[PDB]
Amino acid sequence: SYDRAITVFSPDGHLFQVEYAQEAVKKGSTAVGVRGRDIVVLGVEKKSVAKLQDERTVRKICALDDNVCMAFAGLTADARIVINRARVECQSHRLTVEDPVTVEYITRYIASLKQRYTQSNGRRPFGISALIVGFDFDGTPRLYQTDPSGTYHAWKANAIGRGAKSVREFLEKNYTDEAIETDDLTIKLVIKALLEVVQSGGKNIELAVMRRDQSLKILNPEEIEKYVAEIEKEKEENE
Amino acid sequence: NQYDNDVTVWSPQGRIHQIEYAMEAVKQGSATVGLKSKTHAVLVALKRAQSELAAHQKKILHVDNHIGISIAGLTADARLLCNFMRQECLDSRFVFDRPLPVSRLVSLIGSKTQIPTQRYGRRPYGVGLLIAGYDDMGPHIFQTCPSANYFDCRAMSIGARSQSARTYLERHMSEFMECNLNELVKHGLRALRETLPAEQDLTTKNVSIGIVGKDLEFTIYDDDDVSPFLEGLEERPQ
Amino acid sequence: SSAGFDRHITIFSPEGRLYQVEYAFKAINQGGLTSVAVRGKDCAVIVTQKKVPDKLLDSSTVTHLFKITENIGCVMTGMTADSRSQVQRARYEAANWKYKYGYEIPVDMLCKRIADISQVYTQNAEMRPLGCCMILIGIDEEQGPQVYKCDPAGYYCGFKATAAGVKQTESTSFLEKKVKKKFDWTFEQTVETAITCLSTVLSIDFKPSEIEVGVVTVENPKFRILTEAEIDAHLVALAE
Amino acid sequence: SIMSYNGGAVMAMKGKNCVAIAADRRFGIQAQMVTTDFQKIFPMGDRLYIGLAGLATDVQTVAQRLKFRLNLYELKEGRQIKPYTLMSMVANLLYEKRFGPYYTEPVIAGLDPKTFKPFICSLDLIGCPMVTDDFVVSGTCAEQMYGMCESLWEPNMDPDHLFETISQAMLNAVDRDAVSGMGVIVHIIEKDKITTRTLKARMD
Amino acid sequence: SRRYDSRTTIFSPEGRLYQVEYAMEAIGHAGTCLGILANDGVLLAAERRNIHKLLDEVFFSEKIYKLNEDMACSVAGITSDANVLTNELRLIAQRYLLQYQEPIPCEQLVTALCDIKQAYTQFGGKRPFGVSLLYIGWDKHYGFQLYQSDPSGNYGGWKATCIGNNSAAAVSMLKQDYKEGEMTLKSALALAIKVLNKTMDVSKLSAEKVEIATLTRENGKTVIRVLKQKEVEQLIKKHEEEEAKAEREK
Amino acid sequence: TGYDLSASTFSPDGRVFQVEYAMKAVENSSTAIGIRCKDGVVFGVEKLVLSKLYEEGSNKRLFNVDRHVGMAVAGLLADARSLADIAREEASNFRSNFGYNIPLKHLADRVAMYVHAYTLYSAVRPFGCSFMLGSYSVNDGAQLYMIDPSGVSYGYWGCAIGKARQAAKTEIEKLQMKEMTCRDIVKEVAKIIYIVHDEVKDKAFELELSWVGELTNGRHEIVPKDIREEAEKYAKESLK
Amino acid sequence: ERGYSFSLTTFSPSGKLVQIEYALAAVAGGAPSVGIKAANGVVLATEKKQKSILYDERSVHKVEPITKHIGLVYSGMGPDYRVLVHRARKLAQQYYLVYQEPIPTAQLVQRVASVMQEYTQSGGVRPFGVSLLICGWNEGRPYLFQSDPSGAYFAWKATAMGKNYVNGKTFLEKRYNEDLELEDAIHTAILTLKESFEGQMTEDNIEVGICNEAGFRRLTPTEVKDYLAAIA
Amino acid sequence: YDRGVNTFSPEGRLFQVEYAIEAIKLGSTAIGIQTSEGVCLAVEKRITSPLMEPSSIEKIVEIDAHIGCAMSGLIADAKTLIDKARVETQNHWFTYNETMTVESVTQAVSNLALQFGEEDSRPFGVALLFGGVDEKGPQLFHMDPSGTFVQCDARAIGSASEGAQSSLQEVYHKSMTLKEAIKSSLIILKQVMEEKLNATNIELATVQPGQNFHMFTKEELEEVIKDI
Hints:
Chain A is an alpha+beta fold. Chain A is 35% helix and 16% strand. By secondary structure, chain C is an alpha+beta fold.
């Protein structure tokens, strides 16, 4: 009935220590992600550089294989172990079976690793939540998410971090039944969704796309500054 | 109440309460009655329904060609001791090429359930075994307990409200050594009907009867062959 | 000063104390016994009473004098069950010396190895620290006779006159009053002081059937337990 | 034999205040050469080298394991290693593979790190150390190297005549061997500097 | 038996960590370390604790630990817990050189330690490391670098670094007086003697209360210069003139 | 109290209450006595019928450890069964390693050290049993032993374990047991059981008598009291 | 056992380790000791009083050698002292089997402090209650180190451990200097040991070991009687 | 701490096993009905977002080509049960060249549900319904985290399982047909759920003797809803 063990149930049937892991995800930076027609896209917010450090070591988006991406939340220490482990599995799968790894296979591995890591006492569960995006499974663009309980799950648009309930409510009135083709439009959808940031500084947005055939493409803060300009410009014409 | 947490902790009165609590788990299951003649050992149990249309949960289960056991208590420790029970029987068939003596099988169970009643990290087995058998010296009725005190007996009834069955057996235990296979069974199921509230009746779908005999392999009957046994009974004396 | 679990397990308290070991020092005192060892000469004497409260209880299966090896004997105080397990390690590890090293173990080296076993029970937790005490005697070549004493804390020392049991503070006060003058110790002086010190602390003037005498001497270096008859021979000799 | 699978020759020689060490250059399988630039002399700190000969697998393997243990030693202690300490270190590493032994025979040469005192020693394939005062040799063509060094060695020699002695010893002994040759490299070290020369040898 | 349970691994009801927040508070009650990049070097500065006049200091290095061949590290926190890390950290860099025969490239050394430091916050009820420590070095791929270890396992690559409740106000000076792009050694050495004048509250800046080690890439060697006490003196006397100029503009 | 959960902790005066608690669980068990004559050992157990469905010789407390050694347990019956299997297994190793029958003085030492080990650690509890050990040999005579839950083991001439421990040995000691034959002892054991508490607070009981000595040629077995029935014919004569 | 393996030491909310600060209290409540590094050797001296007139003084020793040039004293509890002594003996021979050379005193303290480190962090055990003073004359210069139950270590010119160490802190600061001989160092080591001793100091109440460059040596009561023979 | 992983009550069961039954009650509902023509099955998806993909939530999995499944309670622990339940039917085919019966599947499944503790963890939080057609016709079973394994004729679990089982006993009789039982089931579904009963909230699974394969309906389910 208490709240200081993981093998205990509540009298109404809860696992509060797994539920306390999901609170630690909400203290993280927000990241969103949609799938397009052919080109997928995701982006992170809340960079907040502190004027005196290099910024290639604050990497929050990474690639597991040559065709699958990753974006997380929570605390950055536990995220490094999960990323470093999943690189081995998507590489060792290629050895035993000569296919490339599907996006559905690697998320079952991360969820099953977070599954068995919950059950035994003295193993503090991973306080992260991941987003796995890859147009890998034979021209089919997909994006999934995880959960600290260990439930891999598929969305078509997603938001995590501090204040995802505002963005997930924003995306339901924004993601049209019209599937947004002309992939700069889909990036403009992400850039407009990320424009509903907690402060919306405009320069604290890091977006990364993938056109389903290339490698990962980090956008630069001059092309990304060009897309933020047409957002307020087309919004001025709506008045 | 501060001594009432582990199996390891003795009380200031000398009574370990965790063993005393596993006795209470035996009373949660239904009643079951075992008895024997000179030639035939019969144990009869009472099924319990879960819902109106679900099947009734079984009680009597086969072990070997000369041993069958009844059950009362947790179904977790039921199949856990059963798998240990079946393993020891076929080892004597494999090594010695004889069936086990029934008496020294039960001493293996008392050694089995002793260790989780003393070391920390494992609960006692809440279970209510009644054992019928044939060694070279005839039929046997045994009972066990979660305190690992196995008892030889000539008639026994354990489970919920099973005292009323025991009072029936004491005033008829002299009659049991002489009767044949037939009324020995319906001496036994006259005892189960006092472990019932007086408004319902012992039907076909809620009772099981297992018989092992001197020339008879242990056989479990259920729901269709109980009707040759349920004939020839009187109503309840109300 | 109960802080954390310092009254229960072997951890440090404030002010550097630790209480479970100094609870064991008066875990001897529930035995109700007193033992005396004396080194004065080319010999060494153990004396300890027995207590037989039952006629049904035997007489030979009571004696606390325990023969470790042929040249080493010991006496045990404290509770009986922890005492006899302590003697099992002493008998065992003395024979490992003879097997590994090819000669007889010194009485000094044995009391170290016993005290180091009592160390780990003090150091590690969840392991009960054996509330009993051991006193040894034996002859060492080119060193004379010795008396050693090992604590439940693992502290050992070696000294001339030894009291253990209930009445240390009364007996050791008497032995310093006795051994301050270097009188001649002629193996009858050694027994006479060993008897009459205990005879004044307990104030009994006892029958020959309550005590035992363990002995070792450089004329017969074997450990030797005295007979009921010859205990009476020393007893009437001091009857003045 | 397994020692005769690739060939090799390592020679060290003690001078007055200096010490010299030399080896061949040929790498090859039993009769077919492969290359003529195979390193067999490895620096272990300043003014202290080591030479390896035998099976070319264990030449490269032991030289990496010994470098592994050396750098951990020179960080727990601020000082550098003494030449006696290295000899005890190598003999420990070889004796651990007592029954699975490495097929190599090292030769250690170097000066004292504090004084100027030279040092030479060589070991067996299981780690029996052996210090001398004149020369040590190892390799397949051992007996040819003993015949040259017993006649040409002098007690107190300048770095000029020490260079000419170990040159004439290595050139004449290796040309009598079949599976050794294709060039000879010579390190001559001293208190002030380190000189490395390569000699004009028969390439047949 | 079961009732002797230490926590060490349990989330808050709000979602924060129990011991990790406590361990970062002890580092504020420790010594002071910092470092700054240059275009052609990198340096470290340390504060001497327990400078009583009956010690020896014959190790020639107390906060600095030359660890691979071209990297060193400062240290802050529990001193006795730090010796487990540095003996481990020297052996990670050395088992790499056995494997590839090329020195460790100055980042994946840090991730190799930080995954060990993280792992005591995961499985196994044990005490975490109460040690934060710095990193200086040089590689083929990026050159001169600084890194910042944490008890949580998080690291970052900085250009001017920090110890906390001891010296968090130095970064406010470092954001004010570190010019970007040009950061050469004599400009950097004059900067650090000004910073330690503020944070280390010893008046007149006794030279035996500080310790400075530098690193310069020189002709293919990457020397690590633990500079001696004679040139700490002229570094102070260089700062002594800067007091006299500071009143001329009044 | 508040110091008495684990068996690995001391009290503030220096004892262990978990050993103290387990001793008086044996006190609530029925009385079983033992007595030895000049050429054998005779056991005797007061055993009470549970209700009626006991089957006349079930769950007996007279065990049979070796060819010439058996037990007379009292206390928790299931705990004594596992403890008896230790003694059965211990005598087999002595047979296999030394080639002859186990001496009873050595057998009690091996068991009591095993009982001692459950009095130290927090993971296990002490046993709730106490028992007797009787044997007979031509080179050693008859011996009779006694083991408490703490592990203290030494020899008696007569003993009793149960509720009436004091109330039975009050009248054991008025027997001249040093010169009686064990066939005379069997009818004398019968009255001592029958004197104390036949059916006062209980309903019914049944007598069990084990039997080892020179008349059995060193074997240990139950008496033939189905033969001659002389126990109850002679014990029930004490009604007047 | 069950196999628990949980440590007994955790951080306070202030950030301090509570049990290690308690173990240092047991160190300060021990027998006093003093160590002085002189120009030619190191002097160790301790204060050994028996509780009675019965105890033999030739049985137990306080100044204890490790190698033939390394000695070691303590101030704490007697029984925990003998563990790390026997530990440091076996540890010194493992150096000698590898490198064929007697271990330097700086390298010995590197490894002994890691042993005392291991009982703090590991599971279910408490730390020591013994601080040490380690001496030796390796490679000309002599050395004098101190370790503590925390696992740290230092390098002293002259220091004191045990009871009244703050008095010997002040007295050695006023008495010692840069250089003396060994004989001057023993003179000032008894004079600071006479600060907190009993009424009578004999050849048996103190116990002194030295470090010549010829090796480690503890002194017999013949010399200590003749050294305390009215030389202060 | 508060009647932990291995500690009896003063009266009855373990409370952790008792609390495991309560964790099923927050799960989604599910109904399976055994009929002599075959076993039908139904479940509710409980989709939260439109961006949330509907078919990523599975409730009916394929254990074997003639054995279905249905789950409730915790989602995460049920993937452990389905994994070895697929394996141990496949081990049986490897060593016997025959299909494992439906009853003897859950014997092996219930052997692992009662292994919790420190012997070589917590109990599971998931109930199951197994439908299958073996040689004894169609079968329908039910298990629980206590391992109390039993056969049912028509069972409903999850949230609102009490009100479903009361309403279910009115409509059931012995001579049902499969086309009758499917529309008889979903009437009970929309009376206990709250959203509009459409083709996106529920899914079906029917196994037949002659149609061992295809334990599924796919947008023929749209025809069934408009006919009720």
